[PDB]
Amino acid sequence: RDWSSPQQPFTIYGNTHYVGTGGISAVLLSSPQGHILVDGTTEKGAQVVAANIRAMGFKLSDVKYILSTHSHEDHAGGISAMQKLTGATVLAGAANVDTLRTGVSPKSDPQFGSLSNFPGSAKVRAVADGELVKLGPLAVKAHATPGHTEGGITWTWQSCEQGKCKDVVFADSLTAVSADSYRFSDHPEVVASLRGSFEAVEKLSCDIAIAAHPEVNDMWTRQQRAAKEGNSAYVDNGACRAIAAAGRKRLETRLASEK
């Protein structure tokens, strides 16, 4: 379950399909009028993602949007390649747009000094908090969830099976991690951002959460359960509350260690 590892794709619920690697989530939200891809994994992982979308029966050329959670190599490293293979437009939080274009995270990132650059993407555009991304019958809402990066977005939609619908959340990372030289206690905008994001995420309507690092919401344990119990295994309307609580815990542990 390395970041670039192959992973057989699978449907989580309705038109929501996992197409990521063994280590990094990516989701295809499908329709007859074309598809939305959330995240690209790594540069090497783009070849996995692309094969996975085809394995689920879909054409790359029908992927119209690529939505970015945030602009680090593990989630975004494959976006450029995917953008070239699909022709899609890439959508991201305002403050991450320049990072996706260049593949270089800025000094405001707590991990600056320890991040690896990744390929820059074409066709990157900003979305605002609350904004809807529409494609045919698809409707995906952007929620600003800054802190791990300034432009982090958590994306939400509804998927249905014969009219039984669930609220699905692709949860951006909420983790306070840094370079050795970085003190969170000196950076109030990042701390405030993280706290506001924990609050936003724990309030989301959230039947199925797919975390950017899938194991954050126990994806693989859930998939193993689904073999027997079906896709109810992915459903847990407390999962966004749990991702938020873990984020909060990680930040409070860190602030205490900095005293």
Ligand X SMILES: C[C@@H]1[C@H]([C@H](C(=O)O)[C@@H](C)O)N=C(C(=O)O)[C@H]1S[C@@H]1CN[C@H](C(=O)N(C)C)C1
- Residue number of the CB atom closest to ligand X: 173
Near Na ion by CB under 5 A, which window of 106-114, 133-141, 160-168, 191-199?
106-114
35 labelled ligand-binding? no
Near Na ion by CB under 5 A, which window of 38-46, 56-64, 109-117, 158-166?
109-117
Question: 80 exposed, middle or buried (CB, 10 Å; 0-12, 13-18, 19+)?
Answer: buried
Strand partners, 138: 135
> Scanning residues 55 to 74, which ones bind Zn ion (CB under 5 A)?
72, 74
Residue 183 binding target from ligand X, Na ion, Zn ion, none, CB below 5 to 8 Å by type: none
218 labelled ligand-binding? no
Nearer to ligand X, 69 or 158 (CB): 69
CA 170 – CA 67 distance, rounded (Å):
10
Q: Determine contact, residues 83/90, Cβ cutoff 8 Å.
A: yes
Q: Which two tokens stand for residue 27?
A: 């989701």
CA 40 – CA 149 distance, rounded (Å):
17
For position 177 contacting ligand X by CB under 6 A, the verdict is yes
Neighbours of 229 (CB within 10 A): 11
| Distance in Å from the first CA to the final CA of the chain | 35
Q: Which of 16, 175, 178, 231 binds ligand X (CB under 6 A)?
A: 175
For position 173 contacting ligand X by CB under 6 A, the verdict is yes
Near ligand X by CB under 6 A, which window of 34-42, 80-88, 132-140, 209-217?
209-217
Neighbours of 192 (CB within 10 A): 12
For position 245 contacting ligand X by CB under 6 A, the verdict is no
CA distances from 59 to 86, 91, 135 (A): 9, 20, 16
Query: What DSSP state is assigned to residue 149?
Result: S
- CB 14, min distance to Zn ion, A: 26
Residue 191 sits at the vertex; the CA angle it makes with 187 and 193, to the nearest 5 degrees, is 115
- Type of residue found at 154: T
Q: Which of 28, 90, 142, 212 binds ligand X (CB under 6 A)?
A: 212
Site string for Zn ion, 70-109 (x = CB under 5 A): --x-x-----------------------------------
Binding site for ligand X (CB under 6 A): 72, 74, 173, 175, 177, 212-213, 216
